[PDB]
Amino acid sequence: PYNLAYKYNLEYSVVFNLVLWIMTGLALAVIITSYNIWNMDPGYDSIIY
Amino acid sequence: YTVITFPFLFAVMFGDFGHGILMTLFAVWMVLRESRILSQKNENEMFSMVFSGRYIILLMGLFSIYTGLIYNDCFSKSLNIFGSSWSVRPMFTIGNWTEETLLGSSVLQLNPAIPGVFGGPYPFGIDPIWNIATNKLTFLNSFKMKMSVILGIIHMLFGVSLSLFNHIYFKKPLNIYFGFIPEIIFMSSLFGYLVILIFYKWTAYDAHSSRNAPSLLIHFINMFLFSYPESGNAMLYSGQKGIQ
Amino acid sequence: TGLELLYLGIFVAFWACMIVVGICYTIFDLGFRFDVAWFLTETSPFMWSNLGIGLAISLSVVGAAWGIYITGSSIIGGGVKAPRIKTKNLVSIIFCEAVAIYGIIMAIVISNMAEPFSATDPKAIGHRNYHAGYSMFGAGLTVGLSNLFCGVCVGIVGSGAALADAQNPSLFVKILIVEIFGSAIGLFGVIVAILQTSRVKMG
Amino acid sequence: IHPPVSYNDTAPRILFWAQNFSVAYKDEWKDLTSLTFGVENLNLTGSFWNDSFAMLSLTYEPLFGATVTFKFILASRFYPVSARYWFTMERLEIHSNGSVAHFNVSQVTGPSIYSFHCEYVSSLSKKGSLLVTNVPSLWQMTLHNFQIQAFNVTGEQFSYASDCAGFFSPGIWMGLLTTLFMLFIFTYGLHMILSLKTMDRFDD
Amino acid sequence: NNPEYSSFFGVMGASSAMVFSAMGAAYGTAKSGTGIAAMSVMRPELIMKSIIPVVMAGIIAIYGLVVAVLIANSLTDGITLYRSFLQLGAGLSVGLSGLAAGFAIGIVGDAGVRGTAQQPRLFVGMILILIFAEVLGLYGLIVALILSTK
Amino acid sequence: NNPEYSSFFGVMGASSAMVFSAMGAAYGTAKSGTGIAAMSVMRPELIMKSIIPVVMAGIIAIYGLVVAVLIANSLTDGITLYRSFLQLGAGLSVGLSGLAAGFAIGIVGDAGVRGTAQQPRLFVGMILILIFAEVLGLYGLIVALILSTK
Amino acid sequence: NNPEYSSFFGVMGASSAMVFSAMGAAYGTAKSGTGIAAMSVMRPELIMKSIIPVVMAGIIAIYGLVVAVLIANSLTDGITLYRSFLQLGAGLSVGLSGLAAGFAIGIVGDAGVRGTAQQPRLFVGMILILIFAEVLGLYGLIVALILSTK
Amino acid sequence: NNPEYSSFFGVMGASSAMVFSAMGAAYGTAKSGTGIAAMSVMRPELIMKSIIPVVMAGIIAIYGLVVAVLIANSLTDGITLYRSFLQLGAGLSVGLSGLAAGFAIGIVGDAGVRGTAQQPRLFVGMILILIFAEVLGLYGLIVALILSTK
Amino acid sequence: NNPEYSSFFGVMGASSAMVFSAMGAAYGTAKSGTGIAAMSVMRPELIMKSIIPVVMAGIIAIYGLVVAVLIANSLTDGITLYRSFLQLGAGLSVGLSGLAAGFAIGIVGDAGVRGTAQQPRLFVGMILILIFAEVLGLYGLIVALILSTK
Amino acid sequence: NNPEYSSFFGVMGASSAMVFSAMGAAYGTAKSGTGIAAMSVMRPELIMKSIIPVVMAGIIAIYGLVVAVLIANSLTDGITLYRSFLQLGAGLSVGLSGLAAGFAIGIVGDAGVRGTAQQPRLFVGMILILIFAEVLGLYGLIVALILSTK
Amino acid sequence: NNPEYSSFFGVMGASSAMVFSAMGAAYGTAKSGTGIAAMSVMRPELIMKSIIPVVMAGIIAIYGLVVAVLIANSLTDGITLYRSFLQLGAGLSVGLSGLAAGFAIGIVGDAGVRGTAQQPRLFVGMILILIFAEVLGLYGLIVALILSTK
Amino acid sequence: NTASYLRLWALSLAHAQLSEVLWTMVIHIGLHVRSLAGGLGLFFIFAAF
Numbered sequence A: 001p002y003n004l005a006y007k008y009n010l011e012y013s014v015v016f017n018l019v020l021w022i023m024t025g026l027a028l029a030v031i032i033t034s035y036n037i038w039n040m041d042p043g044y045d046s047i048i049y
Numbered sequence B: 001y002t003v004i005t006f007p008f009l010f011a012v013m014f015g016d017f018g019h020g021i022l023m024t025l026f027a028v029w030m031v032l033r034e035s036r037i038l039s040q041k042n043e044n045e046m047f048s049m050v051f052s053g054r055y056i057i058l059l060m061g062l063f064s065i066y067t068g069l070i071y072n073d074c075f076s077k078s079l080n081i082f083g084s085s086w087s088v089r090p091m092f093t094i095g096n097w098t099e100e101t102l103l104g105s106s107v108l109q110l111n112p113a114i115p116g117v118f119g120g121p122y123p124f125g126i127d128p129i130w131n132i133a134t135n136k137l138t139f140l141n142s143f144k145m146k147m148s149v150i151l152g153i154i155h156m157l158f159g160v161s162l163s164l165f166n167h168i169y170f171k172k173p174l175n176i177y178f179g180f181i182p183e184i185i186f187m188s189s190l191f192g193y194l195v196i197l198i199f200y201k202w203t204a205y206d207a208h209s210s211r212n213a214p215s216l217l218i219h220f221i222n223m224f225l226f227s228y229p230e231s232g233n234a235m236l237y238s239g240q241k242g243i244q
Numbered sequence C: 001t002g003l004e005l006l007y008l009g010i011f012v013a014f015w016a017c018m019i020v021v022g023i024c025y026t027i028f029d030l031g032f033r034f035d036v037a038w039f040l041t042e043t044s045p046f047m048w049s050n051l052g053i054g055l056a057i058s059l060s061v062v063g064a065a066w067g068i069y070i071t072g073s074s075i076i077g078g079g080v081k082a083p084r085i086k087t088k089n090l091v092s093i094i095f096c097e098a099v100a101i102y103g104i105i106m107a108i109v110i111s112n113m114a115e116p117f118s119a120t121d122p123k124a125i126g127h128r129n130y131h132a133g134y135s136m137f138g139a140g141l142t143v144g145l146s147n148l149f150c151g152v153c154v155g156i157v158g159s160g161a162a163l164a165d166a167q168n169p170s171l172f173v174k175i176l177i178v179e180i181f182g183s184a185i186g187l188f189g190v191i192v193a194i195l196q197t198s199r200v201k202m203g
Numbered sequence D: 001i002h003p004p005v006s007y008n009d010t011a012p013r014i015l016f017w018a019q020n021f022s023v024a025y026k027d028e029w030k031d032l033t034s035l036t037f038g039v040e041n042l043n044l045t046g047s048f049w050n051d052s053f054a055m056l057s058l059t060y061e062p063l064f065g066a067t068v069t070f071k072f073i074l075a076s077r078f079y080p081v082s083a084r085y086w087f088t089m090e091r092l093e094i095h096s097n098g099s100v101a102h103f104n105v106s107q108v109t110g111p112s113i114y115s116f117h118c119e120y121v122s123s124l125s126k127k128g129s130l131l132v133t134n135v136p137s138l139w140q141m142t143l144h145n146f147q148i149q150a151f152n153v154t155g156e157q158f159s160y161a162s163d164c165a166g167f168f169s170p171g172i173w174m175g176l177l178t179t180l181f182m183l184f185i186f187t188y189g190l191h192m193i194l195s196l197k198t199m200d201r202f203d204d
Numbered sequence E, F, G, H, I, J, K: 001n002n003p004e005y006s007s008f009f010g011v012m013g014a015s016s017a018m019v020f021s022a023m024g025a026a027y028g029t030a031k032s033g034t035g036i037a038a039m040s041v042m043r044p045e046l047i048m049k050s051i052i053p054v055v056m057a058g059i060i061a062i063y064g065l066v067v068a069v070l071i072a073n074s075l076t077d078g079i080t081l082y083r084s085f086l087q088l089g090a091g092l093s094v095g096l097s098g099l100a101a102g103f104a105i106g107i108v109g110d111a112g113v114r115g116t117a118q119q120p121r122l123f124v125g126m127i128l129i130l131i132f133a134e135v136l137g138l139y140g141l142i143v144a145l146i147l148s149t150k
Numbered sequence L: 001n002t003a004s005y006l007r008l009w010a011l012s013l014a015h016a017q018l019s020e021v022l023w024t025m026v027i028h029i030g031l032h033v034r035s036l037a038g039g040l041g042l043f044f045i046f047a048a049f
């Protein structure tokens, strides 16, 4: 390189924002439903013992 | 004392002509049938309340009819009786806003709203042109708020004034000369001034009289608040500062 | 309590990300990129004005709703044995509703100072407009929050007084002063909301 | 690969570089990348440097049958906000047949010490509306990966690049704030509706 | 000069105006239905007597729908970004007003339904309290309408 | 100028409509099924009569479908970024209104089906309250049909 | 030219189209398992007839499989950022619809299975409700198709 | 000359000085009123001599109003971005001092009102603590007043 | 040119696949072991036939390993960011599917093992549900294959 | 030469100092008042002899006000972006130390007043333990001084 | 050159060193105070010997003050930003170690005061376990000192 | 009470807008061209009105 240029960036705003927000939305959905299925209540009636 | 002027016969503020005639028709049919209705068994407690209220229902229907007539909004559609005022040809030919037959349908979509040589109110109510317009919301809002202020102030004034007779009947001159005179004085000095200002704004201007800017709507109803500390500018007619 | 856990997790994660990005920005001598001025400038003042109006009316109305329901449940519960309280106590209810009114008229006054722009650049075009937009947004937030909070206080006090009336009906007059104090506090909020947007030019 | 153009009357002062610098007159596209970067000699007559000004002039005698001249104007001054010097591109001028067409740059600015870089510098809306003017003209120019430095420049190499791509755009930030308020209201409603239960047993 | 993405704010204003009012009406309907089901086990004749909280929630939903329809019909391609923010503000205001109104409607309707199941004389008084709830939502509507022009 | 990344908004709107309607219908169906299972232990001969509420919940799901279909026939790469916002708003409105309707219909259906198991006289009032919930969902659909076309 | 990262969306859609639905099915199966734990101890003779919820969950998993496989083979490096967004939306919608359908399947199956341990006559109603929830998942797949072909 | 957006921080400071002071006042008044309404049933002869905590809770709002009015009157479009920061800091300080003072006033008023309801002789001691709580509030006033003009 | 940090995405995809498969298998075997320990005092002689859920949960690890191997083999510096995205998506999908299989296997194993301790004849019915959960993980694997060599 | 927005850090440092000292003092006064009211039901004489924690909260408020006014008197337009950070650090340190000391004072007073009501000889411990907690806050003051006057 | 501005990091480190140690000491004092108040009701003669945790919390606060004054004495405008990072590291380490020591001594003293109410022989036992607490704190001190004068 | 007197006017505005929107949403749809198709179903639409 004859001169220390930039990283030749792209339309960072739209792609970065949309990707970050869809990533966090999908991750939040996954963790919330996995937490809901984590604490499934069988009932723990007298049948258990 | 109240009956009609009570907040139970101006208990419509929704008169749509047709709605008033419907209420009156229902109440009149029910009053015509009250004999067999009381003779027969009751249906439900709500029907019992309606039966107790039939008279008020009918008379409120009459007042709703009158309020719909003055509002000139029959099923939200206005009524044209004995002229409508306004026009378009004088506004465009004299006002140089002509040649908008298809240009007005291509260039000036919903643009034209200017008074030229016009004026003159509906002899009875509100012109149907205000209904079929699109500035209906602003004009109706201002008109209804001002009607609000005047009606409420006169009503509360009458309510307080009745107490003077109420107390002079029960002797008690100390309260009359010391307790209710201050109430009326304060109420008048704070609200009758607003009413008089509203009427003065209504009467002391015209279409071609807005200050510099085209319309300004009202521009003086609210900037004269309940304290108006200083400055203000705008409308400062001589003596208003001293009276305030 | 899962919802509380989720809200706390989002809160702590966002604040940790914010502090870490701030420390990274200040460490990497990249302060000029984190430009608050550009954010407050290139953002349209119309959003600030309209959001202020919407919050000014909405916070007021939802605080009034909080008050009216928190007192109506109390009234209906305490009115089974004594039906006479079903209406006489209503004098402490309208306060909350009147509190909501203190929004709409306010929501008019600020909305009375809205004009279009027909301008895009921020250099010397919009300085007074910037001040007007920010001031009216602040006034709207002030009135909305104060009105909501006074509404909830008045509703709480009204429920307490209504349950007090269920045993001795002669203490309502002696206890009416607290809720009118709360309504006066709401009146202070509306007064400062008036004063904040008193002298502002928009255009 | 191509070395950047360097106005260095006494020392490296103006550094400019691109990839596909192209110009169209009355919609006649032509590339000048090799005609400005490959060839060492260049008609830099009128090039000017200053402690606060930088007018870079590039002249082409046989372009469009006339000596077409491009003038880039750069200015820097001490902004009171941070007591630091900020440089800002002002305008570009196109001189041809005596006619002087004008083009205004939109947000090309940064700290004076560093060097600016952007992806697309063009007047065409599709490839970024970075160049705009009220009066239409026949000049449509594009610059790909445009990098420039004017002040506090040392050596033949570019300094650190304060790129203008940006994490957030004003529209994206306004939309994000609106959606954040909507999400606040919606999640308050969802939390309060989710905290409702049902009867277990009735009276009889 | 028309900025891009201008209709975005108005679109979500309409969407919020519809959705928040819908959620408030749904919550009110659910709470009042639970109250009615609880009360009907001992006073069967009083079912249609106090079904009105459901129609009150329907009224709040109607306010949301009318505001949304007006905003959508006011939508054009070239929004000057001054109208769009007005529409968004009105929509958010009326939506949260409808949400709060539905909240109060549901809670007070359930309470009053239980009371009128227990004490028959308490209904009419409950009426007043309940009606006030709608007024709050109503305010949103009117503060939207003035916001539709100025 | 036909900017890119514009169809994403409309696609997200259609997907949001579909998922939100689906979740509302699922919640309503789950609540109705829990109610009928809890009540059928005593009076199982009227389970056919009590099948009505969940059907209405399923109707909500059908709602979402049509909106999605309206997006599918109106999807093209060349979207001016103004129509895509309209499609997203319509989808979000119908989906979230359907979600609220599903919440209300599930809660009211469960409570009232248990009540009918305890008292048959509730049944008629059933087909009133639930209708409002369904009507609530229909309200959202209207907005969608206004916003999807324009 | 062509965004090289566009494929990131499309493959992600496939991922979604596999996970959520399957996870939902899992939940359903899991919940149904609890019912089987509380039913075979009373009367295990009809244990064969109590496998409806698990096979509905398997059908949901099959829906996830077919949509994921379709979006997978339709994926290519030469996409135009339009097909990628469309596929991502279809996958997200079908996956979350399958998740909701599986949640409803599990809840209804468990409640009805616990109920039927003493009242067999509910079983027929089972199928109808089950079908509805299964039909719910069907809608998801439908929209996926209506996005894939266009 | 003067930087733009410089009134944003000043107006935010005034808004905070109002909101936080009013919220402290409202919560203190609410807690004290709850306590006094609870106690009034057992000994209605001391209700008048127990409004002092409510008076103090209300009076914190008057210092909040003093600061807000002063810094709103001093505010103008042409603020030097330094006076704006001073006013914002003063407003935040007074608002949060009102926060703390109002919470302390409310809780101590509730506890002392109950104590006076059972033990009358506590009342006088009660009053002392109240003053100390306001020792907080007005102190915040100071850290704004001398800060506002300097 | 070839964009860098594509091996970043591929490596994270393989790592996530292994991580989530391991987590799902661990949770499944944890619940299965809890159920086995609970049931052991009931019928100690039936421990052998009750390890099927344990091994079934443990199988998830082999899909995890095979996907990790299939990704690591394709790992190289010269990847055009498209193969890397495909591998990342495949890894995430298979890992989350194995996680779902682990949850389902663990829950159903615990419940059914307690039941089969209470009543024997459930045993064969056991494997049915387990096999379904098993094939659920299988789904991920096959889609991973379609997403591996593509 | 001197950048603006430098007074920003100083003003918020002073405001935070005053605010957090206020929060600590309010917490201390609140807990002390609650404890005194709880213990005053049986022993009315010890009320005047057990208000020491309130005085400690007051003196912590005194220290907070003193340091805040010291920062306020040392604030000027020509702040050099070096002294301002010292003001911010000193204010934050003193305010947060005061908050912690006030919380400790409040809880220890709440315990100690009840203990003294039960044990008449515990009051001696007061005249030591509180002071230790109290001097903690004093410690913060000193560093603030050595961080402000520098 | 003075890159960026090291004074910010210096003051933040000093403030953190003060506040975290103060908070840990306050928590320890709170736990010791509630323990001693609880134990005073039974064995008032052992109150004097039970104040050891309070004194050690005061010692922790003394260590925090000493390290804060030492680390802020070296603060100067002309700092090369390296000594500033040493400043911040030393302050954070000592403050957080003091907080941990205070947490530990708080629980240890509470439990030991519980135990000593019946068994006086436990008292000397405290002098072992408790001592390690401040040793931990002392440990932080030393890692600050080497950092302070590195 | 001066402020509270403003209440009935909100009902007035809301009733006017409700009537106008109901008209423009039902009757305006019901009256159009192709008279046979525009009036064969007018009975149902008007009954809904």
Ligand SMILES: *[C@@H]1O[C@H](CO)[C@@H](O[C@@H]2O[C@H](CO)[C@@H](O)[C@H](O)[C@H]2NC(C)=O)[C@H](O)[C@H]1NC(C)=O
Residues within 6 Å of the ligand: D003, D006, D008, D009, D010, D011, D012, D156
């Ligand atoms: C001004 O810039 C030119 C262009 O870079 C310099 O020309 C030199 O050309 C030789 C040819 O091999 C190369 O070393 C470089 O391209 C240039 N050298 C340097 C040091 O830049 C020219 O020398 C520069 N003049 C000054 C005074 O620096």
Ligand SMILES: *[C@@H]1O[C@H](CO)[C@@H](O[C@@H]2O[C@H](CO)[C@@H](O)[C@H](O)[C@H]2NC(C)=O)[C@H](O)[C@H]1NC(C)=O
Residues within 6 Å of the ligand: D019, D020, D022, D029, D030, D031, D033
């Ligand atoms: C700079 O970009 C221009 C515009 O694309 C290029 O000009 C055209 O390039 C295409 C490439 O497919 C050719 O088919 C055309 O014939 C070119 N038109 C011309 C030269 O008038 C140009 O080649 C690019 N230059 C560089 C160095 O990349």
Ligand SMILES: *[C@@H]1O[C@H](CO)[C@@H](O[C@@H]2O[C@H](CO)[C@@H](O)[C@H](O)[C@H]2NC(C)=O)[C@H](O)[C@H]1NC(C)=O
Residues within 6 Å of the ligand: D048, D049, D050, D051, D052, D053
């Ligand atoms: C270099 O900077 C000097 C400033 O030190 C410039 O002098 C002024 O520039 C402005 C901007 O065009 C003119 O309006 C003034 O008239 C100039 N001053 C005088 C006394 O003429 C100068 O123009 C800059 N450029 C050059 C080439 O010197």
Ligand SMILES: *[C@@H]1O[C@H](CO)[C@@H](O[C@@H]2O[C@H](CO)[C@@H](O)[C@H](O)[C@H]2NC(C)=O)[C@H](O)[C@H]1NC(C)=O
Residues within 6 Å of the ligand: D025, D064, D065, D066, D096, D097
């Ligand atoms: C500058 O002026 C000259 C005048 O000759 C232009 O040259 C002619 O331009 C016209 C149209 O622009 C062509 O049709 C002719 O072929 C050109 N040559 C001659 C001899 O007439 C030239 O194009 C102008 N340059 C610009 C940039 O406008």
